[PDB]
Design an enzyme around this catalytic site. Structure first.
Site, PDB file in Angstrom:
ATOM      1  N   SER A 255      29.643  15.469 -80.153  1.00 28.31           N
ATOM      2  CA  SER A 255      29.508  16.038 -78.923  1.00 28.31           C
ATOM      3  C   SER A 255      30.284  17.560 -78.902  1.00 28.31           C
ATOM      4  CB  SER A 255      28.955  15.598 -77.606  1.00 28.31           C
ATOM      5  N   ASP A 349      18.084  18.953 -77.141  1.00 27.16           N
ATOM      6  CA  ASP A 349      19.382  19.018 -76.656  1.00 27.16           C
ATOM      7  C   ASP A 349      19.394  19.842 -75.275  1.00 27.16           C
ATOM      8  OD1 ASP A 349      22.143  18.735 -75.830  1.00 27.16           O
ATOM      9  OD2 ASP A 349      22.864  18.917 -78.192  1.00 27.16           O
ATOM     10  N   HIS A 377      20.310  15.453 -76.804  1.00 29.90           N
ATOM     11  CA  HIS A 377      21.670  15.420 -77.250  1.00 29.90           C
ATOM     12  C   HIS A 377      21.881  14.578 -78.485  1.00 29.90           C
ATOM     13  CE1 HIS A 377      25.799  17.055 -77.165  1.00 29.90           C
ATOM     14  NE2 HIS A 377      26.261  15.740 -76.788  1.00 29.90           N
TER      15      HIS A 377
END
Length: 410
Positions: A255, A349, A377
């Site tokens: 992330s 994303d 994502h």
């Protein structure tokens, strides 16, 4: 704005889960909870479903009262912790471990997306407490290490708290590779812990550290160089563990953690065999246009406001005014030589733009990349197989990545 990024006008379509908790649960969270995967690692649908039903009956929704919100999880969190304590006293270590980690999962979600209230800050401390009780009772126990922050400057914490797991029979004589896991905006060392037993089973040590302005990171939130100091302290500590081969340290950023993995490939090139950015950004993640739209997209809560809080700003506008200084393009990081870098993300994303993969490939040395078309994502699940296959090849492991991946779902 709708013409600026790869995903075009997708940036102006509000996601249904922002309407209410009921929509978050029904359309986004119930499925991963049932499957026992992020953000519900170590968790059970049996624990969360009752809490969800009670939150839905209250009709909670954005803007959330984080004290009101967090409190909804505490009765269940406390119930699971008491079952764990009784199991431990009875000598049922496997059962005690399970229920401590189930408790840690309920505390965790209560302080998602990031602790921004006193009950969420309480939930972080309580969650860490029960996580480490559960971790201590694992067959191969995961330990907290409070790494001395020797590279810290004025205003910074004195320690970098990390998870540590060393495979059995690792020694100075027979040292092992180490995967340094860098966690994200919401998932901290108590979440990404789910990867550690898999690595241990493949003869790989793990260290898990949080990014600045999350979990127990001692780093100055507003100082773009604060991560550099943190990784100097962490890599000094790994180097002092002679059972770890310091020439075989691989940093994997998840992330938001991907930004830090990409950054440290440059800042700590000579101390890292490789870094991986999975769903990370670099530049356009700091854009006004991106940040002014991302609050209403795939992220479960308010991504841009949460990002602003993590970078030490009291509101989104104050962050956007200064956010350019964190860009790996603007601050000159991407012009520097890097160690081996692997970039993986879904093209679509809506948390960090795929445009930042392009910026990463537009500057300095060539980098390994896998784009995942038609995925958002992190480009899951294929991203995990891509990355494990590459690390197994890099470190000369058994290449049995299916076996490793199967250990992730709770």
């Amino acid at each position: 704005a709708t013409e600026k990024y790869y995903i075009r006008d997708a940036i102006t379509k509000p996601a249904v889960h922002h309407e209410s908790y009921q929509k978050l649960w029904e359309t986004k969270w119930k499925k991963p909870c049932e499957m026992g995967v992020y953000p519900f690692m170590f968790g059970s649908i049996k624990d969360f479903e009752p809490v969800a039903q009670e939150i839905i009956k209250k009709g909670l929704k954005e803007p959330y009262d984080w004290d009101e919100y967090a409190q909804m999880y505490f009765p269940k969190a406390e119930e699971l912790a008491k079952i764990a304590e009784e199991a431990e006293a009875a000598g049922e270590k496997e059962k005690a471990s399970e229920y401590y980690l189930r408790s840690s999962a309920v505390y965790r979600i209560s302080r998602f997306p990031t602790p921004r209230s006193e009950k969420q800050k309480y939930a972080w401390r309580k969650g860490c407490e029960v996580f480490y009780k559960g971790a201590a009772l694992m067959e191969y126990p995961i330990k907290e290490v409070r790494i001395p922050h020797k590279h810290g400057i004025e205003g910074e914490g004195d320690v970098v708290p990390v998870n540590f797991l060393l495979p059995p029979n690792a020694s100075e004589t027979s040292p092992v590779p180490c995967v340094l896991i860098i966690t994200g905006l919401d998932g901290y060392r108590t979440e990404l812990a789910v990867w550690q037993q898999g690595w241990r089973s493949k003869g790989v040590a793990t260290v898990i550290a949080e990014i600045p302005g999350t979990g127990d990171s001692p780093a100055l939130r507003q100082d773009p160089t604060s991560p550099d100091r943190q990784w100097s302290s962490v890599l000094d500590w790994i180097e002092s563990q002679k059972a770890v081969d310091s020439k075989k340290i691989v940093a994997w950023g998840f992330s938001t953690g991907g930004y830090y993995a990409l950054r440290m490939a440059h800042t700590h090139k000579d101390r890292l065999l490789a870094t991986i950015s999975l769903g990370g950004g670099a530049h356009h993640m700091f854009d006004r246009e991106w940040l002014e739209h991302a609050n209403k997209l795939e992220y479960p809560f308010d991504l841009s406001n949460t990002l602003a809080y993590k970078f030490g700003y009291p509101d989104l506008e104050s962050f956007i005014e200064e956010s350019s200084k964190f860009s790996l393009l603007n601050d000159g990081t991407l012009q520097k030589p890097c160690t081996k870098v692997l970039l993986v993300n879904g093209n679509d994303d809506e948390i960090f733009p795929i445009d930042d993969m392009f910026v990463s490939l537009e500057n300095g040395q060539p980098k390994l990349a896998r784009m995942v078309k038609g995925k958002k994502h992190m480009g899951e699940p294929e991203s995990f197989s891509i990355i494990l296959e590459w690390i197994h090849k890099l470190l000369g492991l058994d290449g049995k990545i299916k076996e490793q991946l199967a250990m992730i779902p709770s």
